[PDB]
Every structure is written in C-alpha cells, then in structure tokens.
Amino acid sequence: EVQLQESGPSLVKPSQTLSLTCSVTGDSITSGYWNWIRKFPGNKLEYMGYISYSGSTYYNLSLRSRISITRDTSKNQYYLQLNSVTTEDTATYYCALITTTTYAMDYWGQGTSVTVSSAKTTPPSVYPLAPNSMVTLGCLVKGYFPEPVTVTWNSGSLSSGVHTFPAVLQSDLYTLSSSVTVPSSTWPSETVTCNVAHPASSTKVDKKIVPR
Amino acid sequence: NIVLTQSPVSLAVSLGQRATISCRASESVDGYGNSFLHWFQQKPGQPPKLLIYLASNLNSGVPARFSGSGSRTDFTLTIDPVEADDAATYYCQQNNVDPWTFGGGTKLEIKRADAAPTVSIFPPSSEQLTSGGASVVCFLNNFYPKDINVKWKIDGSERQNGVLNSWTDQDSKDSTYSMSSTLTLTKDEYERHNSYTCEATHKTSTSPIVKSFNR
Amino acid sequence: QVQLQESGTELVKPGASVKLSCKASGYTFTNYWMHWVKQRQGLEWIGEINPSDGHTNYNEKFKSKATLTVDKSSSTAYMQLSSLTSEDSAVYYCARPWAFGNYGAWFAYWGQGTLVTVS
Amino acid sequence: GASDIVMTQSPKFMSTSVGDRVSITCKASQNVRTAVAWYQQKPGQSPKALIYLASSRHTGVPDRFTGSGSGTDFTLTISNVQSEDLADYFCLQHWNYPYTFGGGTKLE
C-alpha cells in the first residue's frame, strides 16, 4: 500500500526556484518510476518528468532545460526543482508512481498548490452567515492569499448538504464561501460551526453560527 | 510533438446510459506489443485516478462499467452504465513517445431531471460590520441544468459592481449544481438602503426566483 | 551495475553456424527487451527479443541470418547466426534499452562485444 | 528496404587541439522527432551513450557534451575537447523500425 505526499512552499516569487519534495511510504523508490505532473488553473495536465528506480531521469521536452529531479534513497524521498519560475508555473503539483505492472501513473499524491506571485500572504477574515423544514447556514472566508483554504463543518462531522464554492480572485485577494443545510429541528438546537484553515498564514478559525 | 485530442469536449449522459468518449493521437502510441495509452478520471479537489491501462486493461479495483478499446492512433473509453459518481473530467495519456502528453480532457455531465435552485440570502454579519465592511451573500443551491443567472437589487434598483460569483462543479451524489453570489458594499453604503434582493433566472421557472431582506 | 557479459571470440568455417550468448545481470532480465547489433566499420541493428514471451522483431536485412532466443532461468540471451560468409565477420553486441516503450528503446547498456571471424 | 530511415552523419573524420569545440551533425532522411541518441566508442570497446532523446545527457557524462535538434537535423557538440575524447562517435534513431545508425565520425 504505497503512499505519496507532496510538500514545499505554496507561494514562490517570480524568477526564483520552485522546490518540492515527494515523501514515499510503503514502497521503496528503488523500484518503479517516480513522476512529477502538474495541473494548471485552467485544468490542463502537463507531464513533467521522472527519476527511475535506477536513478535515470526523463524530463519532458518542454521543461528539459529548466528542471531537475533528484532523490534520497535513505529517506525514500524524491525532489523537484523548477528554475526561473514565472506566473505561468502556477499550478497544482502532483507526484505519482509508475509500476511495470501497468506502465501507467497508478498511484498519485493528493497534490500541492503552488502559486507564483509577488503578492503577499494575507490571512482571511471569517464571517458567519445566518438567516421551512431545512435551514441553510454559511461561512464567508474573505480576503486571503494565496490559495488554498480548507473549510469543514463541525470538524467534518457535518458532511452531507455542504457546498464549498471555488475561490474568486479580486485585487490579488481571494474570497470563498461555504453553505450547509441542516434540518431546522437541529439548529440552533445543536451548534453548527465552520472550521476554516489557511496554512500559508498559519490561520485556523472556528466560527460558530449564531441566530440573529 | 505528439498531440492527444479528446472528443467531445463535454457531454451529458442520463443515469444508467452509455458514455462514449474518444482520444485520437497524432502519432502512434503502439510499441513493443502494447498501446501505451491510459485513461484517467479526475473529480474536483482530487488527483487523477487510473481507470484503464495500456488501452484496454481494467485497473485493479475499478468498476467494469469502464472499458477501453482501440490501438495505434484511435482510442475509446466507454462508461456503461453511467452513475452519479462519474461526474468528472476524463483524460487520456500516452507514454510511448517523447514528449509524454495528456489529452485536453472530456467533461462528463450527468443528465438528471430539472430542478429549481433553492435560494437563500444572508445579511452582513455584525463581525464584518464592526470592521467597516458589508457583504450580502446569496446561495442558489442544488439546481439543474447548470445554466443560471443572478441579479442583485438595492431598494428596487439593479446593482452590478461589487458582485462576485462562484459556481460549483456537478454534485457527485445528486447531480445538481450550485452557485454563490456576493454583493460587497461599504458599511456606510449598506446603511443608507433598506431592501436587498437577489434574483435567479433558470429554465425551471417562468419568473425569476427572488429572495430578499430589509435592513 | 547493469552488466551484459557476452561469450568469447568465435572462429567459424564458411557455411557453418554459430550461437552467441549474452548473460545479463544487475536488473530484472524479463522486464526489458534485448537488442543485437553488428559492427564490421559502422553499426547495424539486427533485431530484438522480449525475454518474457520470446517475441522477436528483426531488421529485414537479417531475417535470413539471425535467430534470437532467450533462457529465462539463466538470464541469458542468444543469437544464432546461420551459414556464414566473410560478410558476417564482425563484432556483435547485445544491448539493453534504457526503458519501456519507443521513447525508451535507445540502447543504454552494451555488452563487451563478441568477435566472429569466418575462415 | 526503401522506407528504411538513413542517418547521414558528418564529418567523416576530423582533427583538433585540446580545448577546442567541435560539432558533429546527423541528418535523418525522415522526421524522427527527438528519438536520437549519440554514442562514443573507443577502439576495442563497446559504444557508450552520451546523449539521449536528442538533448538529454546520460548519467555521468560531462557537460562538455551537448546535443540539440529535432525532426531531421541533430548536432552533437563537444566543448573543451580532451585527450580522452579521441574516439568514434555515432548517432542512432529509434523512431521507427528498423533502428538505424549514422556512419560514424572519427575524432583524432
């Protein structure tokens, strides 16, 4: 049961070097082919390259002179370096494995968002949204940078009936909202809280939704 | 360089019925007895997941509802029957020839029954107000089809600037869509008006669906 | 290290046949195809074999001259050269592709070569 | 066969002084995209890969060796030529069967 996990900065200045790490657990990187892939904000996927079990590398033609992939077999980690990044390198970066069972990228990390910008990290303000068989409540997460932000309700206990909307960028600040619908029997009888995290600013907020 | 072209770029298929999507390669992806052409499903907020490898092999644990065929430069992914959970974008990928590439993706929509948006409007919170800002929020939730328009009115008059909108992808459970619209004003502007209104126009309704509150 | 160890120098009478070998180590033998190459002054690709299933693909120029086989248990590839003439005097190499697929087909690891002299 | 790809390699041989930069070209008779590798071969030794996929350097090869090109025109450039570089050089295409080599260049 191999597991891959990307880590590294979420925000990088233009012209600087982007560096990411993939930490592998379960399987040794001395087997298979260890890949980096990215997905642009417009959703297109681009294959970047690999380092093989033997240490050989394959760099995709369009990145061939800007990229380096290295590894550390003792730590079971491998690494991406992308040089002289521009705003066009903003993307979600994935590490994935190819085994010779399928010759296909068969196991994938959850991906890490990297933003290339000179804009500054800014924490969000979180506002409760409060007002029939069902009642809909919400949270407004406003004015943060960069992506991403995570929102849960009741620490994830409240799952169904949740909509968290894609963030909208305005003046280099993002704004996102999330709605949750619950039986009117349960609110405000039982508390409803949104939990908002923004790793880039080390922000974690809990906002209890209170009747007006 | 080799290019993978997927078609259609999007399609809507009824629950229980067949999706057929195509991938054409500009150069042959066959080599050494294999077609190095693989198919992936990518749901929002998730990484791609391998469905079919080497053109026609079911990846371990994947439903046999998914099947792949083809060779050389012409490939097909078939999904039959389509289920709600299949709302996703589908990608082909080749690794026979440098440069390795992905197709541009095919978005599969589930064609379900029409459903009117549930609209809810929310005044600015005292938290934001005490800080000098005023955002009025409107949720237009669980509708189908995805086409929808929102209009804001303040004291009966349409307001256009200060509005930001966001749309979800299709829900994996009920096959609906949702939209969020925020009208942001200054506290001072917000306090000199009484009626705040958000209106949805949608195929399911001959009149706009309106929610309001007076300050 | 990947290593391909080929058999020793051969002296072959005209019209006779010879079978060369290439013992592979330092990688999983059956996960890679094997190529063979002839050098008299330039190089010519003879053909390739998949050790996993024995499938072969030949350069048409050598279809009537070379026969490739493998012994999976011993991680050894073989090339039989038939009915030799002086034109077959050459150094023959075995070589392993870098990786899979066509992009990976380039010959990354070579044997030391085997001299064959017809006389 | 008439459809076999021909790799036309030039020059046939050359001489230079230590420290100099030299270039070897290969012209493919058909579009082979980037599926071209370059090899070095010393007398009595097997070929050793220098460059693969037209422009990537094989493990351990010094950056004095550079490859460029795509389609039909490919170049191997050797900068700061050293005594160790006196040898034969060959290109290989692996775009389509049969795989074929350039005729070679002797650097002496």
Residue numbers in the entry:
A (entry chain H): 1 to 82, 82A, 82B, 82C, 83 to 100, 100A, 100B, 101 to 126, ...
B (entry chain L): 1 to 27, 27A, 27B, 27C, 27D, 28 to 211
C (entry chain A): 1 to 40, 43 to 52, 52A, 53 to 82, 82A, 82B, 82C, 83 to 100, ...
D (entry chain B): -2 to 105
The authors write:
We use AP33 as a template to make a structural mimic of its antigen-binding site (paratope), by exploiting the ability of the immune system to generate antibodies that are specific for the paratope of another antibody. We applied a mutagenic strategy to identify a specific Ab2ß, B2.1 A, which requires the same binding residues for interaction with AP33 as the viral antigen.
To verify that B2.1 A is a genuine mimic of the E2412–423 epitope, a Fab fragment of AP33 was co-crystallized in complex with a single-chain variable fragment (scFv) of B2.1 A, and the structure determined to a resolution of 1.8 Å. The asymmetric unit of this Ab1-Ab2 complex was composed of one molecule of AP33 Fab and one molecule of B2.1 A scFv. The structure unambiguously shows the positions of all the amino acid side-chains and of water molecules at the interface between the two antibodies. CDR-H3 of B2.1 A complemented by water molecules mimics the shape and character of the E2 epitope, even though there is no sequence similarity. B2.1 A mimics the shape of the antigen particularly around the critical E2 residue W420, which is deeply buried in the Ab1-Ag complex. The hydrophobicity of W420 is conferred by several aromatic residues in B2.1 A while W420 itself is mimicked by FH98 of B2.1 A in the Ab1-Ab2 complex resulting in the loss of the hydrogen bond. Interestingly, the interactions of L413 with AP33 are mimicked not by an amino acid residue but by five water molecules in the Ab1–Ab2 complex.
